Design a protein around this ligand. Structure first.
Ligand SMILES: Cc1cc(-c2cnc(NCc3c(F)ccc4c3CCO4)n3cc(C#N)nc23)n(C)n1
Ligand code: NA
Ligand code: NA
Length: 361
C-alpha cells in the first residue's frame, strides 16, 4: 500500500501554514484529528472516509499581528482530556482546550518569538520551548512553573530553531541559526531535583517564588554537520537527524563510531556521519521534517510541493529507502508534515495555506 492523494483544501487567510500535528493521543473509536497553525490561527480537522477533511473549530488570537509558528499536543494528567499548546512570533505560549478552542492559560517569558514547542515523551506536563532570544525553556504546565532556562555564553549564540527530546526524555538536542547542535542532559541530579521541586510548588502554600535553573553549559556541541541555519533536529535512537537549507538531512552522532552517547564529555571534538538523505529544491529557511510514531518513516516537503518519504526500517541509516509523492496541483512550499499515529495518513501544509491529505491505500 502506497500513499495516494485523496483530498486538499485551503484556509481562508491565504497565509503560510507553518505547523501541522496529528493528535497521537486521540482515543480509541474516535476519528483521527490534526491541528494546523498559521497566520494568527489554530484550526482542527477530522479525517473521515472518502478522503473527507472535516472542519471543526479555530482559535483566533486577539492580536492580529500574532503569527503562530508551532503547536504540540499533550493531555491533562489528571483527566486525560487532550490539550494543544501553540506559540509563535509574540513569544506567548497558549494552552488551548481543543474541544471548545478556549485558551486555558498562557505563559510569557521568552524575549522574542518561539520557534518550536515539544512535550516530554514520558511526562505530559513538561513543555520545551525554543526561542529567537537564543534560549530554550522547560515549563511544568501542571504547576505553571519555569523549571529551567538553557542558555548563557556557551549556549546558542543566535536564534534557536528546533529541539527534540530523546526516547526517555533524559536529554535534549537543540539547533539553530548559529549553525550549531547542542546537547542538554536533563537527567542530571540538578535537573531531576528541579523537576521534583517544580511539582511540589504551590504559590498559595508558600512565600518563595519558584527558582528556575539557569543551565549555561551544554553537554556537547558541534558546528561540523551543517554550514547554514539548522532548522530541524530529531533523535533516532542514540543517533541524530538534522537538516539545514542545503538539500540534505544528515544522520550523525557525537564522538567516534563506537562512543556511547552517555559517555560523551562536553569537550568531545569529534562527530561521526552515518549517512545523508539528499533531496532537491528545499534551500529556503524554516522547513521541518517529521517522523511517524514508531519512527519507521521520515517525511519532508520541498519548496515546490514535492514530498519525500524515507523508510527507516533497514539495518543502517544510510540504507533508508526513499519514495516521492507529487500532485500536479500541489506546487507551493510544504513547511511541515504529520503522520497519523498508525502512519495510514500523511498531511502536508503549505505556504499558500493549502492542506494536502495522502492516504496509504
Ligand atoms: C516566509 C516566512 C517564513 C517564516 C517563518 C517560519 N517559521 C518560523 N519559525 C518556525 C520554524 C522553525 F523555526 C524552523 C523550521 C520550521 C519552522 C516552521 C516550518 O519549519 N519563523 C521564524 C521567523 C523569524 N524571525 N520567520 C519564520 N515567516 C514569518 N515568513
Ligand atoms: Na477538497
Ligand atoms: Na504565596
Amino acid at each position: 500500500y502506497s500513499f495516494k492523494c485523496v483530498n486538499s483544501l485551503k484556509e481562508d487567510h491565504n497565509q503560510p501554514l507553518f505547523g501541522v500535528q496529528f493528535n497521537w493521543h486521540s482515543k480509541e473509536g474516535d476519528p483521527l484529528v490534526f491541528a494546523t497553525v498559521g497566520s494568527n490561527r489554530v484550526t482542527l480537522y477530522e479525517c473521515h472516509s472518502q478522503g473527507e477533511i472535516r472542519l471543526l473549530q479555530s482559535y483566533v488570537d486577539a492580536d492580529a499581528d500574532e503569527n503562530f509558528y508551532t503547536c504540540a499536543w499533550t493531555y491533562d494528567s489528571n483527566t486525560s482530556h487532550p490539550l494543544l499548546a501553540v506559540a509563535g512570533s509574540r513569544g506567548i505560549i497558549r494552552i488551548i482546550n481543543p474541544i471548545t478552542m478556549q485558551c486555558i492559560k498562557h505563559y510569557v517569558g521568552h524575549g522574542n518569538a518561539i520557534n518550536e514547542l515539544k512535550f516530554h515523551p514520558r511526562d505530559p506536563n513538561l513543555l520545551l520551548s525554543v526561542s529567537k532570544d537564543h534560549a530554550l525553556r522547560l515549563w511544568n504546565i501542571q504547576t505553571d512553573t519555569l523549571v529551567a532556562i538553557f542558555g548563557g555564553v556557551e549556549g546558542h549564540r543566535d536564534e534557536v530553531l528546533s529541539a527534540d527530546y530523546d526516547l526517555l526524555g533524559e536529554k535534549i538536542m537543540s539547533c539553530g541559526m548559529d549553525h550549531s547542535l547542542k546537547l542538554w542532559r536533563i537527567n542530571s541530579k540538578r535537573m531531576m531535583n528541579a523537576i521534583k521541586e517544580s511539582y511540589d510548588y504551590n504559590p498559595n502554600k508558600t512565600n518563595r517564588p519558584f527558582i528556575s535553573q539557569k543551565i549555561h553549559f551544554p553537554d556537547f556541541s558541534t558546528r561540523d554537520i551543517h554550514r547554514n541555519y539548522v532548522d530541524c533536529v530529531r533523535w533516532l535512537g542514540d543517533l541524530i537527524l538534522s537538516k539545514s537549507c542545503e538539500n540534505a538531512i544528515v544522520c550523525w552522532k557525537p564522538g567516534k563510531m563506537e562512543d556511547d552517547i552517555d559517555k560523551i564529555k562536553p569537550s568531545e571534538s569529534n562527530v561521526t556521519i552515518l549517512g545523508r538523505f539528499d533531496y532537491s529544491q528545499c534551500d529556503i529557511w524554516y522547513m521541518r521534517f517529521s517522523m511517524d510514531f514508531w519512527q519507521k518513516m521520515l517525511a519532508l516537503g520541498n519548496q515546490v510541493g514535492k514530498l519525500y518519504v524515507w523508510d527507516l526500517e533497514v539495518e543502517d541509516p544510510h540504507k533508508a529507502k526513499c519514495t516521492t509523492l507529487t500532485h500536479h496541483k500541489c506546487g507551493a512550499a510544504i513547511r511541515q508534515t504529520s503522520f497519523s499515529r498508525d502512519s495510514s495518513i500523511l498531511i502536508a501544509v503549505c505556504d499558500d495555506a493549502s492542506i494536502w491529505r495522502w492516504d496509504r491505500l
